[PDB]
Nucleic acid binder design. Structure first.
Lengths: 82, 129, 141, 185, 82
RNA sequence: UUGCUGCAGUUAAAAAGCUCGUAGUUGGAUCUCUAGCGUUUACUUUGAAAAAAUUAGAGUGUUCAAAGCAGGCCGCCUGGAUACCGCAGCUAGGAAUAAUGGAAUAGGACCGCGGUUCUAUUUUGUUGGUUUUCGGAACUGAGGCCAUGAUUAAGAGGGACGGCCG
RNA sequence: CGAUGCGGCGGCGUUAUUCCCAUGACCCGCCGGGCAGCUUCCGGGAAACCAAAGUCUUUGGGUUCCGGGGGGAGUAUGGUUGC
């Protein structure tokens, strides 16, 4: 109270505070690449995704549509991009 | 919904100053608010402020000095003439020694004393003292 | 708040600051356009097309990569629908509720909600007639 | 090689035109530069003596220039004197239509042909290697403005020493002071 | 304060609060004037010099007199940076 | 104690039982001159026009004053000023603020280029018959150039989809 | 300030679907929208009280309905709706 730098808030407080009520807006979502166990081809998926996505490489389900972030199938390893 | 963004901006600054906060956040930011704050700063009431620019519509963070008693908006934007300006500065200002009415005129947004000096009427935006 | 509800729900999309195309995006403006066309032929909505392109192919924002919006691309070629997305969807919801009401004469809730939908059709139609995307003789039945 | 709109080349760009003519036959960039061409080139004295080179290039080719810029700057900086070179877009700036205008404004002027949009585009084109992440405008007691640009940490070491070049070069062609900070995340 | 003659025409210039910069009133009985001592750089003894802070009733009642004293002490270099 | 400045409506008198909705009022950032113009207003400053009396107000010892328009100097030197006059209509500057639009199936701007019809009323010293150009229009068959043309996507709003919830 | 209802986000450890994850039930935080509650000299009010009934002589965010001492009186008459 009474002294906070509204200009330079601490980055942990910035991330905690709501995406729309931040000092400058940025989404909590991200783009990640999926490595399917029974395939060599790489695919990119949205963290909160809405459609069951298919890898045309081996024709197998990758991520499931959920209330929030899309749950990936067992074996398929996800890695953050930039 | 939100109408007369200046009203929210001035009310926000007023509440912040009454509460005794050393900074205040204003959103969104428009030219009218920036010019109004510039006039308030020039006479030494607020001091330095920063325009946090996101692509949508900017925010302002204003450093507050313990000087501002009141900063009010006048809605709607009344048509003010030189002859009627005595009446307005008699009604709104607390004293004839200090306080300023901010008019938007063809010359620009400026205080009533400069309006008398440059000899031009306009629309009343707000007052501060 | 909402148009016809007391709720003050704050839940929308928060597009990032960086308008810059991501370094890892391999697809080019023309390649994305070809993808949008191929999707549009299968009989989809700009909404659905944008969702499919975001999820599957990893295009964050079509308007950032191409420099033009989905309805605008389909309008520029001429693969755009006759009625706008949102009006079409309100009409199919309206006729669905009317189809339900035709059997159930006691369902006062359905009647009230129909009145609220009809209001949204008329208020949106007036706007589209103002922008001259619909003809001025266009009515609802 | 150089096609001015005035049909009048100067000693400096006629100098640098030749300095570019080597890179076709010398390096493996002949396929790139042959289709491309510059419009104007200038020199500015920043940091009290430091000579910085500007190359005004056409907008439609700029997207192609971006692809080769990162390499081309070093090639140019090695060929002639070790000077800070940067590529700028030649932005035609059509003035705001007043109540007393000429018999020219028959069409609406695009928002891309506006002072603010041009200046923001020039500041984007100036610092191409390090994409702009944040921007602030501080107003000081005297009334003068100051623009604080917030860059990314991906190419910090690339242009860490160019802060002086950018801080000096901006005020020449805009009329506003700029500063450059590197936030953590 | 001053008429066009030149002389100051006032009973007394009131003290302003060091924290909020409000005028401490005549009957502001909750207002505090605290003296903080100065140490000798080498030995760390009370040399005789002191630095004065004044807090108004409002800032005392709010419970922000603590942070106001602390941040003043930080600014004046009595409390060590960080 | 009729509140535009400037009032009330939990209990003193008072918010419709509730939601929709046309008219009404209000409405988010953003764009730095070639005799005709420039996109048009509102706003603001200046100018001319606007009956005296009245009102404000200059001058003047009605013996003072309310008044009056007179009077003052040893034939003379004087006065009978000046201001205000809502709104609207005329006139010339300013362009902040607030409305409106300038190019989106490109019949869009700017440049030289091909033809159809008609006409100007100079011209072959003047005079009668044909054909002309120059001076001036609508219609078109193409071409070059525009850095060619769509600001952002509201902690405004509609709609889409996802897994729930009651 | 601590709870609570719905959804989402992150994280030790208990348990059930044998076990690994993964879903439930708990547990500790966070974010948004709701039903509320406790405390406070923010500030109002005639007070009772109200985090709104605050930001009101330091009086202008937008807009609708509506009161003007107590009775007579929600009466009389007229209109209109209804068997």
């Amino acid at each position: 109270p009474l002294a906070k730098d509204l200009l330079h808030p601490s980055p942990e407080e910035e991330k905690r505070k709501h995406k729309k009520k931040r000092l400058v807006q940025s989404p909590n979502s991200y783009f990640m690449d999926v490595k399917c166990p029974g395939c060599y081809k790489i695919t990119t998926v949205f963290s909160h995704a809405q459609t069951v996505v298919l890898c045309v490489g081996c024709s197998t389900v990758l991520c499931q549509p959920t209330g929030g972030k899309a749950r990936l199938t067992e074996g398929c390893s996800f890695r953050r991009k930039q | 919904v939100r109408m007369n963004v200046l009203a929210d901006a001035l009310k926000s600054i007023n509440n912040a100053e009454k509460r005794g906060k050393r900074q205040v956040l204003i959103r969104p930011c428009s030219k009218v608010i920036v010019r109004f704050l510039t006039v308030m700063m020039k006479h030494g009431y607020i001091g330095e402020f920063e325009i946090i620019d996101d692509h949508r519509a900017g925010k302002i963070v204003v450093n507050l000095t313990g000087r501002l008693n009141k900063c009010g908006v006048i809605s709607p934007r009344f048509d003010v003439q030189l002859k009627d300006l005595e009446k307005w500065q008699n009604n709104l200002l607390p004293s004839r020694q200090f306080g300023f009415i901010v008019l938007t005129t063809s010359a620009g947004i400026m205080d009533h004393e400069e309006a008398r000096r440059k000899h031009t009427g306009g629309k009343i935006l707000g007052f501060f003292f | 708040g909402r148009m016809h509800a007391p709720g003050k729900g704050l839940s929308q999309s928060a597009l990032p600051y960086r308008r810059s195309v991501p370094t890892w995006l391999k697809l080019t403006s023309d390649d994305v356009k070809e993808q949008i066309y191929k999707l549009a032929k299968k009989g989809l909505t700009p909404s659905q097309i944008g969702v499919i392109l975001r999820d599957s192919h990893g295009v964050a924002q079509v308007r950032f990569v191409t420099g033009n919006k989905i309805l605008r691309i389909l309008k520029s070629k001429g693969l755009a629908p006759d009625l706008p997305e949102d009006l079409y969807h309100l009409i199919k919801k309206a006729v669905a509720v009317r189809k339900h009401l035709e059997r159930n004469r006691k369902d006062k809730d359905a009647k009230f909600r129909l009145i609220l939908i009809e209001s949204r059709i008329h208020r949106l139609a007036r706007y589209y007639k103002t922008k001259r995307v619909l003809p001025p003789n266009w009515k609802y039945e | 090689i150089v096609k001015p709109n005035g049909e009048k080349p100067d000693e400096f760009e006629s100098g640098i035109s030749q300095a570019l003519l080597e890179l076709e036959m010398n390096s493996d960039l002949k396929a790139q530069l042959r289709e491309l061409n510059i419009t104007a080139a200038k020199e500015i004295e920043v940091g009290g003596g430091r000579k910085a080179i500007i190359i005004f290039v056409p907008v439609p080719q700029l997207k192609s220039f971006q692809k080769i810029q990162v390499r081309l700057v070093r090639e140019l900086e090695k060929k002639f004197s070790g000077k800070h070179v940067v590529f700028i877009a030649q932005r035609r700036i059509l003035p705001k239509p007043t109540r007393k205008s000429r018999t020219k404004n028959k069409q609406k002027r695009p928002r891309s042909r506006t002072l603010t949009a041009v200046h923001d585009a020039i500041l984007e084109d100036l610092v191409f290697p390090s994409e702009i992440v944040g921007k602030r405008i501080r107003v000081k007691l005297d009334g003068s403005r100051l623009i604080k640009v917030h860059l990314d940490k991906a190419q910090q070491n690339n242009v860490e020493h160019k802060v002086e070049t950018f801080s000096g070069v901006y005020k020449k062609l805009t009329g506003k002071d700029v500063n450059f900070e590197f936030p953590e995340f | 304060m001053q008429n066009d003659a030149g002389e100051f025409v006032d009973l007394y210039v009131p003290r302003k609060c060091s924290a909020s910069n409000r005028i401490i009133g005549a009957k502001d009985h909750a207002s505090i004037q605290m003296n903080v001592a100065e140490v000798d750089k080498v030995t760390g003894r009370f040399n005789g010099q002191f630095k004065t802070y004044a807090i108004c009733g409002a800032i005392r009642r709010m419970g922000e007199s603590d942070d106001s004293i602390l941040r003043l002490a930080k600014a004046d270099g009595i409390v060590s940076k960080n």
